[PDB]
Amino acid sequence: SMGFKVKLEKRRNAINTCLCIGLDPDEKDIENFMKNEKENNYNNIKKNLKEKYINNVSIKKDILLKAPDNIIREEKSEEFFYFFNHFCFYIINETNKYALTFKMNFAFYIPYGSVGIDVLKNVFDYLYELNIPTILDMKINDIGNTVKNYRKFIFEYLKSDSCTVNIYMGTNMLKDICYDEEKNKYYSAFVLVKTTNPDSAIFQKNLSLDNKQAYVIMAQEALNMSSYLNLEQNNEFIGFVVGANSYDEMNYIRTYFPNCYILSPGIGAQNGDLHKTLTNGYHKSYEKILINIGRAITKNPYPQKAAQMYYDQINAILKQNM
Amino acid sequence: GLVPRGSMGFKVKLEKRRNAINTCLCIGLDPDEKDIENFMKNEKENNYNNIKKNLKEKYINNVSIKKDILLKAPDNIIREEKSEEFFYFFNHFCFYIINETNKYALTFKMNFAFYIPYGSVGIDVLKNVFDYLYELNIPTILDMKINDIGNTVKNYRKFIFEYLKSDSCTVNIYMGTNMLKDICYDEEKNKYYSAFVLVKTTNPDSAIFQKNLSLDNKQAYVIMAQEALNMSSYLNLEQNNEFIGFVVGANSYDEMNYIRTYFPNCYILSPGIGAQNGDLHKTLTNGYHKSYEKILINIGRAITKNPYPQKAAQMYYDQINAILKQN
Ligand SMILES: Nc1c(F)c(=O)[nH]c(=O)n1[C@@H]1O[C@H](COP(=O)(O)O)[C@@H](O)[C@H]1O
Ligand SMILES: Nc1c(F)c(=O)[nH]c(=O)n1[C@@H]1O[C@H](COP(=O)(O)O)[C@@H](O)[C@H]1O
């Protein structure tokens, strides 16, 4: 209804940040949450159980509402589901007031089989209830007929607001990701432009087309496709993933494509410089420079305060730039 | 000299299967919602002939997920297990295709995108499909086109190679070749795995980055192929009976010729025959290798959307083999 372009602008007005919280729980994170909860009489799960929108998740809600010691003795095959889902709800409850958007990387939800996809669905349901803008980081890429399935999963099933896409196969895939002709629906995506891999220069900088590096060619071809599709008219957009640690490229992209949307991972665990990234990617509509922080929040034992720190420092930097 | 199924590298598993059935047919198993519905409707109209045949097969008892449901009589599913009906018919469609066609398949390739759009249920199907293929000992490829930073991609490695026990997967290395160290190698367990990296794809606008981008006088697709092989060499994959190969579209005749000419011993996986109308004779001619597990020809919809998939697969098997003979 709203369109992601409008959802972001409105939430930005309400919470006055561009922090994007990454929710990428790994096996150790889930184990540690279980062990800690078992040792603290399930303080955090008990807190989760008092929040209203837990009552609106789709999958195995009555399992999620059971007391933890009853899960362990009466529903032991659901133990992992229960603690994984409660870890996610805990992180969301503790940090959401500081988040312009949450980004969930699909890779963390698949490696146990179906169980993590139920968790992923419940996480998207929960964020949708909270009216928090979402990004599914799935880096999808395929031919047209195949990628329609990701469109269905991401935008119909999860009802995500956006996703990440790798357009190296071609730009035309976006016609079957960001647009549903039969339903007249439009969706937003961030395409990979400059990544945080230590060897990202191999293909992104060292390849070129008539004196422009590959990353610029890719960004321009993504914007060309957004144009073709008329996304921005329908309150949607195609934006760019530009690594936090990639200051020169961030500076170039923001200069050359003044009003583009950028999603920037790489601060915290991958050591990117927050002040430099945010300053080089700055826009007064700062929803156009999403600063993603995953592990520096989710692997912090004090995640509310971790998220608050990033929120407060982003605030101070936004003020300096304004 | 003998080893049980599961206890040999993919290079050797492919060679042995090629020596057994003498083809390079890769059957693609990409069931869409229409396929599942049509299977359910056809089985309901014919008293579930194909499902009953699936239920006769020894190895259906060895799959991991919801065997209790899978082994039920089909009329008991429809009447008593309404919430499991889609799982049951989806999984049985996949078993039916595998049962009908496996005798002609050098490998099966499952594209992940078709198994995710209903949420978790298709992932249970996918796991059972891989467990079933593992028991049949037929070489597998998970077409997932994975790409991320090292720390994240480890999770795909676990899903693909531990959970599904796939032989191989597809990878997009645009983000950086070093991701392969965390896909084709597990440093904790000291295990090696195989992959096909995207080199030249079948989408109509594939040239826009793969050919237009260049370094000096080499196009992106050539540079990416070389980088991938340099990594294979670094990781010692072929020593350990694994490999990094290349996805080169059936419709990409010049690039196929370039790749086979400049990398004479590479493994190529080539989709685009059938539904996408690639030229089979040209593809096989240009990509030919006397070890023809090095030129896998993937055919999905032209088999799986045919009402007689056993015969469609046989026809493609025979057609491929006739072209191989005239090479
Ligand atoms: N999608 C990404 C890129 F394109 C990229 O160039 N670099 C990335 O880190 N990510 C993802 O961004 C997140 C980084 O998380 P954190 O380091 O824990 O703060 C992970 O989900 C990464 O997979
Ligand atoms: N992985 C692929 C590529 F890199 C590519 O360049 N072209 C492709 O078609 N596929 C996949 O190959 C299969 C083509 O299937 P069929 O057309 O029904 O015979 C599908 O799974 C496609 O997603």
Shortest-distance atom of ligand 1 to CA A299: 18
Q: Which residues contact A82 (CB under 8 A, 6 or more apart)?
A: A63, A64, A66, A68, A71, A75
Mutate which: A106, A143, A218, vs B, most B CBs within 10 A: A143
Which residue lies with its CA nearest to atom 11 of ligand 2?
B271
Active site residue B145: yes
Number of residues that make up chain B: 327
Q: Let me know: does A109 contact A125? Beta carbons within 8 Å.
A: no
- Name the nearest CA neighbour of A24 among B176, B155, B117: B155
Q: Let me know: does A28 contact A257? Beta carbons within 8 Å.
A: no
CA distance B140 to B131: 11
> Can you give the three-state secondary structure of B262-294, one letter per residue?
HCCCCCEEECCCCCCCCCHHHHHHHHCCCCHHH
Identify each DSSP E strand in B147-216 by its residue range.
168-171, 185-186, 191-192, 194-200, 214-215
Which positions of A are annotated as active-site residues?
A: 139
CB contact under 8 A, A207 and B227: no
Sheet holding B214-215, edge to edge: A212-213, A208-209, B214-215, B218-219
CA distance B308 to B8: 34
Q: Which residues contact B153 (CB under 8 A, 6 or more apart)?
A: A107, B146, B147, B179, B182, B183
CA distance B142 to A175: 25
The number of the ligand nearest the C-alpha atom of A264 reads: 1
Task: Tell whether A288 is in a known binding site.
Answer: no
> How many Å is the Cα radius of gyration of chain B?
20
CA distance B202 to B181: 27
Structure-block tokens of residue B251: 């419709």
CA A159 → CA A120, A130, A202, A227, A231, distances in Å?
11, 13, 35, 24, 18
Any bridge partners for residue A298, and if so which?
Answer: none
Element housing A196 (H / E): none
Q: Let me know: does A166 contact A191? Beta carbons within 8 Å.
A: yes
- In units of Å, what resolution does this entry have? 1.5
CA A95 → CA A132, A290, A303, distances in Å?
12, 16, 7
CB of B143 within 6 A of ligand 2: the answer is yes
Structure-block tokens of residue B179: 């991701």
Q: Which residues contact A312 (CB under 8 A, 6 or more apart)?
A: none
DSSP helix/strand/coil, A228: helix
> Can you give the three-state secondary structure of A16-50, one letter per residue?
CCCEEEECCCCHHHHHHHHHHHHHCCCHHHHHHHC
CA A97 → CA A135, A310, A314, distances in Å?
17, 12, 14
CA distance B214 to B266: 22
Tell me the backbone φ, ψ of residue B29, rounded to 5 degrees. Answer: -120, 90
Residue A120: burial class (beta carbons within 10 Å; 0-12, 13-18, 19+): buried
The number of the ligand nearest the C-alpha atom of B304 reads: 2
Tell me the backbone φ, ψ of residue B169, rounded to 5 degrees. Answer: -155, 170
Which residue lies with its CA nearest to atom 16 of ligand 1?
A294
Report CA torsion sign: A145, A147, A148, A153.
Answer: positive
CB of A269 within 6 A of ligand 1: the answer is yes
CB contact under 8 A, B174 and A117: no
CA distance B284 to A123: 47
Structure-block tokens of residue B278: 């690639």
CA dihedral A115, A117, A120, A124 (to 10 degrees): -130
Residue B223 CA, distance from chain mean position? 24
Beta-carbon count within 10 A of A208 CB: 18
Rounded distance from Cα B272 to ligand 2 centre (Å): 6
CA distance B294 to A261: 43
- Name the nearest CA neighbour of A309 among A279, A281, A274, A276: A274
For B174, which of A166, A208, A269 is closest by C-beta distance? A166
Q: Which residues contact A127 (CB under 8 A, 6 or more apart)?
A: A92, A102, A134
CA B297 → CA B15, B31, B140, distances in Å?
15, 18, 14
CA distance A2 to A12: 14
Pairing outcome for strands B185-186 and B214-215: unpaired
For A139, which of B119, B148, B215 is closest by C-beta distance? B148
Any bridge partners for residue A309, and if so which?
Answer: none
Tell me the backbone φ, ψ of residue B305, rounded to 5 degrees. Answer: -100, 5
CB of A281 within 6 A of ligand 1: the answer is no
Residue B42: burial class (beta carbons within 10 Å; 0-12, 13-18, 19+): middle
Q: Which residues of B9-18 are buried (b: 16+ CB within 10 A; e: fewer)?
A: bbbebbbebb
CA distance A96 to B229: 45
Q: Which of B44, B56, B103, B145 is catalytic?
A: B145
CA distance B85 to B110: 22
For the domain made up of B1-327, give the CATH fold: TIM Barrel (3.20.20)
Q: Which residues of A152-163 are buried (b: 16+ CB within 10 A; e: fewer)?
A: bbbbebbebbbb
CA distance B317 to A236: 46
Structure-block tokens of residue A224: 């060309």
CB of A268 within 6 A of ligand 1: the answer is yes
Residue A195: burial class (beta carbons within 10 Å; 0-12, 13-18, 19+): buried
Task: Tell whether B279 is in a known binding site.
Answer: no
Q: What one-letter code names the amino acid at B277? A: N
Give helix A79-95 / helix A303-321 axis angle, nearest 10°: 40
CA distance B246 to B210: 13
Task: Tell whether A142 is in a known binding site.
Answer: yes
CB contact under 8 A, B147 and A157: no
Please give the span between the terminal C-alpha atoms of chain B, in angstroms, as a whole number: 32
Any bridge partners for residue B239, and if so which?
Answer: none
CA distance A156 to A171: 22
Own/partner long-range contacts of B77-84 (Cβ < 8 Å, ≥24 apart): B78/B44
Residue B143 CA, distance from chain mean position? 6
CA distance B267 to B291: 10
Beta-carbon count within 10 A of A295 CB: 17
If you ran DSSP here, which 8-state letter would residue A164 be given? E
Number of residues that make up chain A: 322
Out of 3.40.50.150, 3.90.50.10, 3.90.1170.50, 3.20.20.70, select the CATH number for domain A1-322.
3.20.20.70
Q: What one-letter code names the amino acid at A88? A: C
Residue B300 CA, distance from chain mean position? 10
